[PDB]
Amino acid sequence: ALGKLQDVVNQNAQALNTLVKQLSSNFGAISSVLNDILSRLDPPEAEVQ
Amino acid sequence: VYAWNRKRISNCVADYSVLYNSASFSTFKCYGVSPTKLNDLCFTNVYADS
């Protein structure tokens, strides 16, 4: 019966999860973490990724 | 070239300062990493294809 509420809550959480998981996507970059690119590639090369 | 030799480097420390500072290399191009950052990086393994 409480679904109307629970449902809503889930959606919120769901969105956040998706958002957080979008931190782990390459989007075409060599890696999905900025620190690795900064530590490996020089700014002239790193900036495109 | 068709039988390019491969060597494995593991469990060791390499000083790459002497590597990129040498003028005996005509071409020296790094992809996905910078020559200077090598001394400040750790890698599980290295494969040298000669």
Swiss-Prot record, chain A:
Domain of life: Viruses
Ranges in coiled-coil conformation: 6-49
Role of this protein: Subunit of the fusion protein that is processed upon entry into the host cell. Mediates fusion of the virion and cellular membranes by functioning as a class I viral fusion protein. Contains a viral fusion peptide that is unmasked after S2 cleavage. This cleavage can occur at the cell membrane by host TMPRSS2 or during endocytosis by host CSTL. In either case, this triggers an extensive and irreversible conformational change that leads to fusion of the viral envelope with the cellular cytoplasmic membrane, releasing viral genomic RNA into the host cell cytoplasm.
Name of the protein this chain belongs to: Spike protein S2'
Organism annotation: Severe acute respiratory syndrome coronavirus 2
Residues of the full protein shown: 944 to 992 of 1273
